[PDB]
Amino acid sequence: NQFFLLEEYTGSDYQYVGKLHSDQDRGDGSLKYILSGDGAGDLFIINENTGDIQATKRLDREEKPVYILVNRRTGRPVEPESEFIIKIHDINDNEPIFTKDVYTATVPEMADVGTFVVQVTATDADDPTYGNSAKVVYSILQGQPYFSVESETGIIKTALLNMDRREQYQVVIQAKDMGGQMGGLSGTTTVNITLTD
């Protein structure tokens, strides 16, 4: 089977992970299931009779993504040393974060349109491999008209022909989750551009 479990559970009762149902299981009370791992007794808790496993705390995926997982009368082991995947599933709950709070850049005065100024980057602590939670899109908030930024790549280019020293510009770039669709989390950075003479 597969044992996922949604992160950041906000409620007050235990979280059902799933049950270990052996093909060796007879049907009656012939067997009992045993815990195997770190947290397996307080964090994860097992129903001895059935193999039902439940979690006991609210879990943050970003803090730990993955977890490592006999007869009632005799105790004779009919199963091998167990190990399953308890991978905490992902929700979008981390803001995109730029790699630098202030990017300092310069661009030649007599510059053609599309002239590279500086490239900005935002990491995203969420799962880039499930949903759009970490698909970040870059947009310009201040400095607009004079400069452009590539939605996907975060490359800032000059977007104006007639540009001579106003020597200085302050550009604000937004990064946003969910391929930029409304509802996504966002971060900003400021870019100080001086025109080189």
Contact positions vs its own copies (CB under 8 A): 1-2, 4, 6-11, 18-19, 21, 23, 89-95, 128-133, 135, 176-179, 181-188
Whichever of 7 and 20 has its CB closer to Ca ion, that residue is 7
Least distance CB 53 / its own copies (angstroms): 11
* Residue 26 token pair: 């007879």
The whole-angstrom distance between residue 146's C-alpha and the CA centroid of its chain comes to 33
CB burial of 47-83 (b: ≥16 within 10 Å; e: otherwise) equals eeeebbbbbeeebebeeeeebebeeeeeeeeeeeeee
The whole-angstrom distance between residue 161's C-alpha and the CA centroid of its chain comes to 40
* Residue 108 token pair: 């030649």
> Contact between 174 and Ca ion (CB under 5 A)?
no
Among the listed ranges 4-12, 15-23, 66-74, 100-108, the one in contact with Ca ion (CB under 5 A) is 4-12
* Contact yes or no for 136/177 (Cβ under 8 A): yes
Among the listed ranges 37-45, 75-83, 91-99, 144-152, the one in contact with Ca ion (CB under 5 A) is 91-99
Whichever of 129 and 168 has its CB closer to Ca ion, that residue is 129
Interface contacts to Ca ion, rule CB under 5 A: 7, 60-62, 90-94, 124, 126, 133, 177, 185
